[PDB]
Amino acid sequence: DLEERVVTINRVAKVVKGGRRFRFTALVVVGDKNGHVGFGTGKAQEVPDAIRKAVEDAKKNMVFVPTVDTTIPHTVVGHFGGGEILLKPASAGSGVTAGGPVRAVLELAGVADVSSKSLGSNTPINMVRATIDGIKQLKNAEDVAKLRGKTV
RNA sequence: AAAGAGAGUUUGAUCCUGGCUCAGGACGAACGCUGGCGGCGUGCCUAAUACAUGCAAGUCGAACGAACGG
Ligand SMILES: [Mg+2]
Ligand SMILES: [Mg+2]
Ligand SMILES: [Mg+2]
Ligand SMILES: [Mg+2]
Ligand SMILES: [Mg+2]
Ligand SMILES: [Mg+2]
Ligand SMILES: [Mg+2]
């Protein structure tokens, strides 16, 4: 069905009259290997509770990934916020080369061979969001009709 | 056909800009602890500072003027 890949655990704090209070936040990316992937985010007082909340949150925001010939159809770069990820196709059997969160999302999507690079900041949530944006900017060869056959 | 990996550190916690440090490759290398063999290579980067000593450029009698042999 769906797997789970925990990307980050952070101990976050807020200060009140009686000192300060801490609570953990989790970023979790889930998906199946057939081409559906999505990320979530939780915030709870104990780590497993945050993991469960993030898992339940991610299973509402999925997206399809076009994977001609088990790789990305073309090159495209995502620019959400302070994040910057570009994705390029790769030769067969080359594996996945990416940072932490980018690797997580690209493998959980099921894409086998792809090479990327992070050209902006290194905030994990912004890296995930930029990768998802870059994925959304993709387009397949067959669905581009625009009154045309293949002629490619 | 070829095609790019990041991480730690400013804050009570954030997101940005920003430097510093680490993870790879290579030596005509040197130092430290160890050290079996074979093949193929390499070895004064500094004082173009000073040289003890051996060798590193000679050869033609079929171009021409002496002695040993007889
Ligand atoms: Mg930095
Ligand atoms: Mg400051
Ligand atoms: Mg080095
Ligand atoms: Mg020995
Ligand atoms: Mg010995
Ligand atoms: Mg010299
Ligand atoms: Mg003669």
UniProtKB/TrEMBL annotation:
Statement: the UniProt record of this protein carries the keyword RNA-binding: yes
Domain S5 DRBM stretches: 2-65
A molecular function (GO) term: rRNA binding
InterPro entries per UniProt: Ribosomal_Su5_D2-typ_SF, Ribosomal_uS5, Ribosomal_uS5_bac-type, Ribosomal_uS5_C, Ribosomal_uS5_N, Ribosomal_uS5_N_CS, Ribsml_uS5_D2-typ_fold_subgr
GO biological process, one term: ribosome biogenesis
Record's keyword annotation contains Coiled coil: no
GO annotation, cellular component aspect: cytoplasm; small ribosomal subunit
Signal peptide from the UniProt entry: none
Subunit-structure text: Part of the 30S ribosomal subunit. Contacts proteins S4 and S8.
Domain remark from Swiss-Prot or TrEMBL: The N-terminal domain interacts with the head of the 30S subunit; the C-terminal domain interacts with the body and contacts protein S4. The interaction surface between S4 and S5 is involved in control of translational fidelity.
Record-given protein name: Small ribosomal subunit protein uS5
Organism the protein comes from: Listeria innocua
